[PDB]
Design an enzyme around this catalytic site. Structure first.
Site, PDB file in Angstrom:
ATOM      1  N   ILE A   1     -16.420  24.627  15.307  1.00  0.00           N
ATOM      2  CA  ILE A   1     -16.781  26.038  15.444  1.00  0.00           C
ATOM      3  C   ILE A   1     -16.717  26.467  16.893  1.00  0.00           C
ATOM      4  O   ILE A   1     -16.054  27.454  17.225  1.00  0.00           O
ATOM      5  CB  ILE A   1     -18.205  26.345  14.890  1.00  0.00           C
ATOM      6  CG1 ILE A   1     -18.338  25.884  13.425  1.00  0.00           C
ATOM      7  CG2 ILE A   1     -18.554  27.841  15.059  1.00  0.00           C
ATOM      8  CD1 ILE A   1     -17.327  26.522  12.404  1.00  0.00           C
TER       9      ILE A   1
ATOM     10  N   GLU B   1     -18.407  25.390  21.271  1.00  0.00           N
ATOM     11  CA  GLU B   1     -18.865  24.431  22.266  1.00  0.00           C
ATOM     12  C   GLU B   1     -19.719  25.163  23.292  1.00  0.00           C
ATOM     13  O   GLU B   1     -19.508  26.347  23.553  1.00  0.00           O
ATOM     14  CB  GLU B   1     -17.654  23.811  22.963  1.00  0.00           C
ATOM     15  CG  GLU B   1     -17.825  22.376  23.435  1.00  0.00           C
ATOM     16  CD  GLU B   1     -16.485  21.668  23.624  1.00  0.00           C
ATOM     17  OE1 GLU B   1     -15.874  21.273  22.606  1.00  0.00           O
ATOM     18  OE2 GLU B   1     -16.036  21.502  24.786  1.00  0.00           O
ATOM     19  N   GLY B   2     -20.686  24.456  23.867  1.00  0.00           N
ATOM     20  CA  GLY B   2     -21.574  25.035  24.880  1.00  0.00           C
ATOM     21  C   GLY B   2     -21.957  23.945  25.850  1.00  0.00           C
ATOM     22  O   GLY B   2     -21.438  22.827  25.764  1.00  0.00           O
ATOM     23  N   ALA B   3     -22.859  24.261  26.777  1.00  0.00           N
ATOM     24  CA  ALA B   3     -23.467  23.241  27.627  1.00  0.00           C
ATOM     25  C   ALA B   3     -24.153  22.236  26.706  1.00  0.00           C
ATOM     26  O   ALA B   3     -24.935  22.627  25.823  1.00  0.00           O
ATOM     27  CB  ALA B   3     -24.460  23.859  28.616  1.00  0.00           C
ATOM     28  N   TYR B   4     -23.774  20.967  26.881  1.00  0.00           N
ATOM     29  CA  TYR B   4     -24.339  19.776  26.188  1.00  0.00           C
ATOM     30  C   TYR B   4     -24.339  19.697  24.643  1.00  0.00           C
ATOM     31  O   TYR B   4     -24.942  18.771  24.085  1.00  0.00           O
ATOM     32  CB  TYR B   4     -25.720  19.359  26.781  1.00  0.00           C
ATOM     33  CG  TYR B   4     -26.923  20.218  26.405  1.00  0.00           C
ATOM     34  CD1 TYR B   4     -27.734  19.889  25.321  1.00  0.00           C
ATOM     35  CD2 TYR B   4     -27.271  21.349  27.159  1.00  0.00           C
ATOM     36  CE1 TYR B   4     -28.857  20.674  24.986  1.00  0.00           C
ATOM     37  CE2 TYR B   4     -28.390  22.136  26.833  1.00  0.00           C
ATOM     38  CZ  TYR B   4     -29.174  21.789  25.745  1.00  0.00           C
ATOM     39  OH  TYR B   4     -30.272  22.568  25.421  1.00  0.00           O
TER      40      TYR B   4
ATOM     41  N   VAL C   1     -20.645  22.494  18.027  1.00  0.00           N
ATOM     42  CA  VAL C   1     -21.027  22.919  16.678  1.00  0.00           C
ATOM     43  C   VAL C   1     -19.823  22.762  15.733  1.00  0.00           C
ATOM     44  O   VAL C   1     -18.713  23.209  16.066  1.00  0.00           O
ATOM     45  CB  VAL C   1     -21.549  24.400  16.685  1.00  0.00           C
ATOM     46  CG1 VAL C   1     -21.841  24.918  15.291  1.00  0.00           C
ATOM     47  CG2 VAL C   1     -22.813  24.541  17.575  1.00  0.00           C
TER      48      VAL C   1
ATOM     49  N   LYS D   1     -25.042  21.040  14.828  1.00  0.00           N
ATOM     50  CA  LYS D   1     -24.886  21.010  16.268  1.00  0.00           C
ATOM     51  C   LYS D   1     -25.176  19.632  16.864  1.00  0.00           C
ATOM     52  O   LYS D   1     -26.237  19.062  16.656  1.00  0.00           O
ATOM     53  CB  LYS D   1     -25.694  22.119  16.978  1.00  0.00           C
ATOM     54  CG  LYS D   1     -27.083  22.356  16.506  1.00  0.00           C
ATOM     55  CD  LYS D   1     -27.764  23.388  17.420  1.00  0.00           C
ATOM     56  CE  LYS D   1     -29.264  23.511  17.175  1.00  0.00           C
ATOM     57  NZ  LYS D   1     -29.865  24.252  18.356  1.00  0.00           N
TER      58      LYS D   1
ATOM     59  N   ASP E   1     -36.266  34.402  24.200  1.00  0.00           N
ATOM     60  CA  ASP E   1     -34.809  34.457  24.367  1.00  0.00           C
ATOM     61  C   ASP E   1     -34.183  35.306  23.244  1.00  0.00           C
ATOM     62  O   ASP E   1     -33.116  34.983  22.750  1.00  0.00           O
ATOM     63  CB  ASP E   1     -34.215  33.017  24.370  1.00  0.00           C
ATOM     64  CG  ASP E   1     -32.751  32.965  24.870  1.00  0.00           C
ATOM     65  OD1 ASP E   1     -32.383  33.758  25.753  1.00  0.00           O
ATOM     66  OD2 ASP E   1     -31.977  32.091  24.398  1.00  0.00           O
TER      67      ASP E   1
END
Lengths: 348, 95
Positions: free
Chosen positions: A21, A23-26, A29, A44, A139
């Protein structure tokens, strides 16, 4: 072990037929077929153990979402990780698959007043539960509001969440996370502590405004610019509101600025329901102590078609962390995460 | 130029109390580990410490801007942003 984009994604045999799906910091998904429940799910992969703050975020989210049960908050269905603490480098969190989120939706279409009303109600219904637990999300923003294909909304992303504690000073945990500038209440920018549930109400007011116009209301580019965007709409703070700023240096700064008149909401939002704007006015109040709170926002005339305490669950009891996580070294946090995730192990 | 930058550091130090300074120092300690063992007592000593660690000069303001933001000092931040504006305007003379 299953692989995706040349990365280990070791969730089989229960979870198969993977699809990348994003990608992000660390954390990456994928969606996956759950061979037990016969449906596709979201997974995730998180790899936090070299960073104290990522371990903090991971543990906060796991603990909270495992305790919470509410239609408008995302659950955790399952957690996969290695059978021994030494071999654990990644944690895979399995959640209900959701087709979209509010940020994508607003990029895609203008919303009817009935949909804006419904989404706002669901945000506040979920927030009522969160706040009833004595937890601040911290957040809230459109991308953290997941949606399916039938307008059911679930709040996600509880990594920055904290038990409400106005009296306790900062550790830089929230501060070093800055993709949320546009939804940050002014008291967070101006004071180091004293935050209450009203910080989340501010973010919801920002989301409401964004649903009305398909654009962020206060899209500042930097710290000072952010404050200028807020004040350019709300107008210069009153003397009473200047006295919410404990920070004497911040207060002198605000007093130095040129006068700005308040912009009437209906000038900015000429197609909005006038009841929606009266609510918006109360959510985006500069003074965090006078700002409307969640039950009162639900009881506002704009939400009268939906407000229904008989169909708005709350938490049985306040949520508590046994110990403050913010001062624990990453190795201790690793042990706590191993312990939190044990109940999902095959051999449990 | 160098004069405007000197004036900026003076302006900032004029508005940094010793109490203020302990806060600015704490915000730097993870990024520059030698900070504790250095005996920084003045604002001008702090700026010198930043310069010597390649975190500040007349054309490199982003770290003190970062520190002023996280320390919630928009009053100091605004002197830096105004200095940047000034320097940019001065450059419009020689193009």
């Amino acid at each position: 072990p299953e692989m995706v984009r040349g990365q280990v994604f070791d969730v089989g045999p229960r979870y198969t037929n993977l699809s990348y799906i994003g990608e992000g910091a660390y954390g990456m998904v994928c969606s996956a077929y759950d061979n037990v429940n016969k449906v596709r799910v979201a997974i995730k992969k998180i790899s936090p153990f070299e960073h104290q703050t990522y371990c903090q975020r991971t543990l906060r989210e796991i603990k909270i979402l495992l305790r919470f049960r509410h239609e408008n908050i995302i659950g955790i269905n399952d957690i996969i990780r290695a059978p021994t603490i030494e071999q654990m480098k990644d944690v895979y969190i399995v959640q209900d698959l959701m087709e979209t989120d509010l940020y994508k939706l607003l990029k895609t279409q203008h919303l009817s007043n009935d949909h804006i009303c419904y989404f706002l109600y669901q945000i506040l219904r979920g927030l009522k539960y969160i706040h009833s637990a004595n937890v601040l999300h911290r957040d809230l923003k459109p991308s953290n509001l997941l949606l399916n294909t039938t307008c059911d909304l679930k709040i996600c992303d509880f990594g920055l969440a904290r038990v409400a504690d106005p009296d306790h000073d900062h550790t830089g945990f929230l501060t070093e996370y800055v993709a949320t500038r546009w939804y940050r209440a002014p008291e967070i920018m101006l004071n180091s502590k004293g935050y209450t549930k009203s910080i989340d109400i501010w973010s919801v007011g920002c989301i409401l405004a964004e649903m009305l116009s398909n654009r962020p209301i206060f899209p500042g580019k930097h710290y000072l610019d952010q404050l200028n965007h807020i004040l350019g709409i709300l107008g210069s703070p009153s003397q009473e509101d200047l006295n919410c700023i404990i920070n004497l240096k911040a207060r002198n700064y605000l007093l130095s600025l040129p006068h700005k008149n308040k912009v009437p909401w209906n000038r900015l939002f000429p197609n909005a329901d006038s009841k929606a704007l009266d609510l918006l006015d109360k959510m985006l109040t500069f003074n965090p102590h006078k700002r409307i709170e969640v039950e009162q926002a639900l009881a506002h005339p704009y939400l009268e078609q939906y407000y229904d305490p008989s169909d708005e669950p709350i938490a049985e009891a306040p949520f508590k962390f046994d110990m403050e996580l913010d001062d624990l070294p990453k190795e201790k946090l690793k042990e706590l995460i191993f312990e939190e995730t044990a109940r999902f192990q095959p051999g449990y | 130029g160098m004069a405007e930058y000197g004036t900026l550091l003076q302006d900032l130090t004029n508005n940094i109390t010793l109490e203020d300074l302990e806060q600015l120092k704490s915000a730097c300690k993870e990024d520059i580990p030698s900070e504790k063992s250095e005996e920084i007592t003045t604002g001008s000593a702090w700026f010198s410490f930043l310069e010597s660690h390649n975190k500040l000069d007349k054309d490199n303001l982003s770290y003190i801007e970062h520190i002023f933001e996280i320390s919630r000092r928009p009053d100091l931040l605004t002197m830096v942003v105004d200095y940047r504006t000034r320097v940019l305007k001065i450059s419009e003379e020689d193009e």
